[PDB]
């Protein structure tokens, strides 16, 4: 891209892979800073499954209230 | 020689250089390369 590639190019050939990995990772907070979602720093159905699991758990918790 | 002529054919230059002209060019270059090596 830019500014982060010129900074990675100032680091010796032995650590350049690690610096490139750090620069990709530093690309990591920046997007969050640029945007605002704490879940972009690595690598119907979802919602429904989560909802169902929570509901069952809630019922168990309700049973705990019942206890 | 035939591999170099295949280069001439593949680049559509065979209309400008005949097989006999190609052999003559290769011969002249061979002569001067051999004189330079010696």
């Amino acid at each position: 891209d830019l500014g982060l590639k010129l900074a990675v190019s100032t680091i010796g050939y032995r650590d350049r892979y690690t610096a490139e990995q750090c620069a990709y990772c530093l690309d990591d907070i920046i997007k969050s800073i640029e945007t605002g979602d704490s879940n972009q720093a690595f690598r119907v159905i979802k919602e429904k499954k989560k909802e169902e699991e929570a509901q069952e758990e809630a019922k168990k918790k309700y049973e705990e209230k019942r206890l | 020689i035939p591999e170099m002529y295949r280069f001439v054919k593949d680049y559509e230059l065979s209309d400008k250089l005949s097989k006999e002209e190609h052999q003559t060019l290769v011969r002249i270059v061979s002569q001067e390369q051999a004189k330079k090596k010696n």
Binding site: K5 | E12, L25
Partner: protein, 97 residues
């Protein structure tokens, strides 16, 4: 050596006699024709079109550094590998320069 003789011979005949030009013009015309056929064959031409694409990975950075090195003759770079002196040749039509 064969490519130089080949370029000199092909462009020494009608209809395209270039003997009035430097031998480099005949050789350049062979490379321009090779570029045209390479482009026609529907095959990549990036190595012909971008002469500064000599080095892996950092081609755009080198292009920007070359522009800065040319815009002002010795632009100081914070992090550049090495300055190499190259020669460019232009032909100018000037009477007794």
């Amino acid at each position: 050596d064969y490519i130089v003789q080949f370029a000199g011979y092909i462009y020494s005949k009608p209809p395209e006699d270039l003997r009035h030009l430097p031998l480099s013009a005949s050789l350049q015309k062979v490379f321009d024709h090779m570029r045209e056929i390479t482009s026609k064959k529907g095959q990549s031409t990036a190595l012909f079109d971008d002469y500064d694409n000599l080095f892996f990975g950092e081609t755009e950075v080198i292009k920007q550094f070359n522009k800065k090195l040319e815009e002002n003759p010795d632009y100081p770079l914070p992090q550049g590998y090495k300055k190499v002196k190259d020669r460019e040749i232009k032909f100018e039509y000037a009477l007794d320069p």
